[PDB]
Amino acid sequence: DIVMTQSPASLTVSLGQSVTISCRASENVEYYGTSLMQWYQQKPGQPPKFLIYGASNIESGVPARFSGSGSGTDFSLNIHPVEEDDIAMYFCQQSRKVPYTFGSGTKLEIKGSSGEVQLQESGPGLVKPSQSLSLTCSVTGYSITSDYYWNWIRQFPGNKLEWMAYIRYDGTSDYNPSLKNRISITRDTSKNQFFLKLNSVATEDTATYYCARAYYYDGINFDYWGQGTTLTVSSENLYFQ
Amino acid sequence: RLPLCFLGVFVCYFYYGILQAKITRGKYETFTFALTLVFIQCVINAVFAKILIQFFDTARVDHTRSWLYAACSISYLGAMVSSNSALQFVNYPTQVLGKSCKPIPVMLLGVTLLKKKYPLAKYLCVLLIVAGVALFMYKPVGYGELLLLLSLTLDGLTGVSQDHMRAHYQTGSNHMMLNINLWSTLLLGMGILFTGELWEFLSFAERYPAIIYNILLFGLTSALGQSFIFMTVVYFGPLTCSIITTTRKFFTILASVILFANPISPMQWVGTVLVFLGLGLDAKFG
Ligand SMILES: Nc1ncnc2c1ncn2[C@@H]1O[C@H](COP(=O)(O)OP(=O)(O)O)[C@@H](O)[C@H]1O
């Protein structure tokens, strides 16, 4: 699968300076002259925020400070008038192939230091290894039978995102080919929920699981995200700690 | 890829035209059921596209919105019906040469709507190709040319819709073909049922069952062509498909004339040399 590499692991910049973050794909990510690239911004302890799609189109409502550029296998995100607001981690995602991938993440830091869709995730906080697990994302303020993809994603320690799977309102579902044999995504329209089931979770599955709503346009864009639910797989019970 | 697509589309559509002429001009009574013929062609093409998807492209998941396919289908049907009405109202050769001028409207509509920008070399090459093809075809008051203009406009709109679909949804060729053909089949079936031609055609077929054979064969040919055409639509874009279609018609006419040894008028010589010049310039910078 395509592997995205972000050259600067962490960038130290001053207020008002222009910052450029580079992303590179292992393979060409252009499909008929359009680059299927997305840029997201994740503040600490918060779900990633959708910023750019197509490597050049700024999402509506985003400040004009952000801009995208590049093509082929090299892309860049530019913020000329950086302020305190845009201090976070930045991720580059490719929608060229079914296993959508996110970059390692670039951290930015300063020197001297009913009207929308609501999603809520629930699931056990601690699980022993090899025990089947099931997380439930409940949607309020919207119906999951309308035109929107509903995706399950997870973030490991170290902020390495990984798109698990998704289900479309038509019921058509797609999975990460790596995990297609281990996980299963289902939905229940009566309660307006969708569930992700994992079989024989191992210690490597410890992560924060998000349920997001995405619309496909020049690639899949996870505009709306849930608040994330932690999941810790351990061989011992966590008590008095 | 381009030579393969050119060869395949040329031969398949040559046989398609042969079969269409054989079916229409059989004179078994007279065949006045063009609409149901197009309906059968669309149904067969849709079935073929479904087979191709099931056997080759199972992994892919379509992302295109249904309304886009509906719009493309209605535009294509409008173009077809306008062209047929113009042919009814105007002599056959004029309709042919008018339909040969597809690239100009396709490019103009694309520029106006999608805001695409082309180098002036492409502009000159397309203009020269179109002019040469028109000149080579026989060249010698309204209310019949307006229908041809409307058909050209609808073809350009279809090209714009296909370009937008492939650009912003990465629509696969097979999925695009299947969906467009399904919507076209629905609309044509509704029209046939309303107009009542279904029953007349069914009685005509029952009276002369042999027609069925040819029809089926005829339909099959169309399927193959559409495949290649849609491939050319996705890999290279609607403008390249339009240019390919126009050039294929020109080459077919040139081959038929030379086979018949019809005295090639000097204007036709200028037309062919212009077509070659434009094609070569486009290829050198394509
Ligand atoms: N841009 C396009 N999009 C979809 N289909 C196309 C396009 N260009 C050509 N085709 C298909 O190829 C066929 C070419 O037919 P054509 O030779 O133009 O008929 P005519 O000679 O009566 O004008 C059409 O039936 C059409 O379905």
Author numbering:
A (entry chain B): 1 to 113, 485 to 612
B (entry chain A): 13 to 40, 47 to 158, 169 to 314
Manuscript text:
The endoplasmic reticulum (ER) cannot synthesize ATP but must import cytoplasmic ATP to energize protein folding, quality control and trafficking. Here we report that human SLC35B1 does not bind nucleotide sugars but indeed executes strict ATP/ADP exchange with uptake kinetics consistent with the import of ATP into crude ER microsomes. We have further determined seven cryogenic electron microscopy structures of human SLC35B1 in complex with an Fv fragment and either bound to an ATP analogue or ADP in all major conformations of the transport cycle. We conclude that SLC35B1 operates by a stepwise ATP translocation mechanism, which is a previously undescribed model for substrate translocation by an SLC transporter.
